[PDB]
Amino acid sequence: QRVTISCSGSTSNIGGNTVNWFQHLPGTAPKLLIYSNNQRPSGVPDRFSASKSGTSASLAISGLQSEDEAHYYCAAWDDS
Amino acid sequence: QRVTISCSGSTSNIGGNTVNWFQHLPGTAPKLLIYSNNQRPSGVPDRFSASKSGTSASLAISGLQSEDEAHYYCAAWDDS
Amino acid sequence: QRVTISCSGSTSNIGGNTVNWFQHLPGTAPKLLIYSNNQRPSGVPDRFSASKSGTSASLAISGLQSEDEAHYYCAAWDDS
Amino acid sequence: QRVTISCSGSTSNIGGNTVNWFQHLPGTAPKLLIYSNNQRPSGVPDRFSASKSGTSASLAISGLQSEDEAHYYCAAWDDS
Amino acid sequence: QRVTISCSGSTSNIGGNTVNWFQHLPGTAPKLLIYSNNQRPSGVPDRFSASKSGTSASLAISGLQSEDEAHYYCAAWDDS
Amino acid sequence: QRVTISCSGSTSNIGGNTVNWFQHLPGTAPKLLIYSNNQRPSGVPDRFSASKSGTSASLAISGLQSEDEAHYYCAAWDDS
């Protein structure tokens, strides 16, 4: 036999960039405030898996590739 | 036989960059404040796995590739 | 037989850089404050694994490749 | 006799000034280039004169009184 | 006799000024280029004169009194 | 007789000044270049004179009184 199995992954290519951010900002006054008292997630897989709990109270400004990846690739189970 | 198995991974290439960040900012006054009292995640896989708990109370500014990767690739189980 | 198994990994290439950060900032006044009292994650894999608990109360500014990688590649189990 | 001859000249008075030039210029990138291979003037006066040859390949920004004066005042010739 | 001859000249008075030039210019990118290969003037006066050859390949921005004056005043010739 | 001859000259008065030039310039990159291979002027007065040859390949920024004066005042010739 000639069984062929080929999974894949997270191949990335950005290129160029020069994002320069935020420049030339005369006088501002950022006075943010964050205060949380909840958001308790959970997850209870039994047979299969790759649950992904996630909590945040951030400001969430993303420039390039701010992912929170979590991979689980090409699993198997026979129990012969 | 000629069985061929080929998984993949996290191949990355950025290129160029020169992100320069944030420049030329006349007088500002950042006075942020963070105070949390919760967000307790969990996860209970039994047979399979690669759960990924994650908690944050940050400000979350990302310039390039701020990932939080977690990989689990090409698992197997026979129990012969 | 000619069985061929080829996993992959985290191949990275940035290139160029010259990120210059944040320059030419006239008088500011950063007065941030962080105070947490919770966020206790957990994880209980039994058969498979590579759970990844993670907690943070940071400010989370990323310039280039601020990942928190955790790999588990090409596992096997026969129990013959 | 009461012959009266009165020539004049280049009397100048500017006053005040405070020209301040060019200020508050965030990041620029001047990349000028000058390359000349000609412009050969000439002049051949015989009896009278005060020819004025002039050549330039400059950028020619003038703030106040950027003249290139050349005077020849109250000439005479009798050959008695 | 009471012969009276009175020539004149280049009397100038500017006053006030405060020209301030060009200010508050966020990021630009001047990339000018000059390249000449000709413009050869000439002039051949014989009896009278005050020819004025002039060549330029500049940018020619003038703020105040960017003249290129050349004077020849009250000439005479008798050949008695 | 009461012959009266009165020439003039280059009387100048600026006053005040405080030109301040060019200030508060965040990061620039001047990369000018000058390269000339010509502009040979000339002048051949015979009887009268005060020719004024002039050559330049400069950038020619003038703040106040950048003249290139050349005077020849109240000449005479009798040959009695």
Rounded to a whole number, what is the distance in angstroms from the first to the last CA of chain C?
21
Contact criterion met (CB below 8 Å) for D62 and F63? no
DSSP state of E73: B
Contact criterion met (CB below 8 Å) for A20 and B24? no
Report yes or no on chains C and E touching (3+ CB pairs under 8 A): no
Contacting residues of F for D72, CB less than 8 Å apart: 48-50, 72-73, 75
- Bridge partners (DSSP) listed for residue F6: D6
Contact criterion met (CB below 8 Å) for B34 and C30? no
Beta carbons within 10 angstroms of residue E6's beta carbon: 11
* Method used to determine the 3D structure: cryo-EM
**Among B6, B4, B9, B1, CA closest to B71:** B9
Query: B61: helix, coil or strand?
Result: strand
Q: How far is CA A59 from CA B34, B60, B64, in A?
A: 11, 6, 17
Q: How far is CA E80 from CA C54, D48, D79, D80, in A?
A: 111, 17, 6, 5
The whole-angstrom separation of Cα E26 and Cα A25 is 11
The whole-angstrom separation of Cα D51 and Cα D48 is 9
Beta carbons within 10 angstroms of residue F57's beta carbon: 19
The whole-angstrom separation of Cα E11 and Cα C21 is 56
Rama region for D65: left / alpha / beta (φ>0; ψ in -120 to 50; rest): left
The whole-angstrom separation of Cα C16 and Cα C22 is 18
The whole-angstrom separation of Cα D21 and Cα F22 is 5
Give me the sheet containing F61-62, strands edge to edge: E61-62, D61-62, F61-62
DSSP state of E5: E
DSSP state of C73: B
Smallest CA–CA distance from A80 into chain B, residue: B80
Give me the sheet containing E34-36, strands edge to edge: E34-36, D34-36, F34-36
Neighbour subunits, B (≥3 Cβ pairs < 8 A): A, C, D, F
What is the 3-class SS of chain F, one letter each residue?
Answer: CCCEEECCCCCEECCCCCCCCCCCCCCCCCCCCEEECCCCCCCCCCCCCCCCCCECCCCCEECCCCCCCCCCECCCCCCC
The whole-angstrom separation of Cα F59 and Cα E57 is 11
Q: What are phi and psi of E15, to 5 degrees?
A: 80, 130
Contacting residues of E for D19, CB less than 8 Å apart: 17-21, 63
Of F9, F27, F70, the CB nearest to D27: F27
Of B61, B68, B72, the CB nearest to A68: B68
| Surface-to-core class of residue A22, CB atoms within 10 Å of its CB (0-12 exposed, 13-18 middle, 19+ buried) | middle
Contacting residues of C for F26, CB less than 8 Å apart: 24
Contact criterion met (CB below 8 Å) for D9 and F69? no
Q: CA-CA-CA-CA torsion for D26, D29, D30, D35, nearest 10 degrees?
A: 180
The whole-angstrom separation of Cα E58 and Cα A73 is 66
DSSP, residue by residue, A10-67 = --EE--------S----S------EEE---------SSS------EE-S--EESS---
Pairwise CB contact (< 8 Å): A69 & B69: yes
Contacting residues of C for F27, CB less than 8 Å apart: 23-24
Q: What is the structure's resolution, reported in angstroms to one decimal?
A: 3.0
Contact criterion met (CB below 8 Å) for F60 and F42? no
The pair of structure tokens assigned to B29 is: 């006054």
DSSP, residue by residue, D27-64 = S------EEE---------SSS------EE-S--EESS
- Bridge partners (DSSP) listed for residue D56: E56
The whole-angstrom separation of Cα D38 and Cα B22 is 47
H-run or E-run covering E36: strand E34-36
Sequence-distant (6+) residues with CB within 8 A of D16 are E15, E16, E17, E18, F15, F16
Q: CA-CA-CA-CA torsion for D6, D10, D14, D15, nearest 10 degrees?
A: -30
The whole-angstrom separation of Cα F68 and Cα A58 is 66
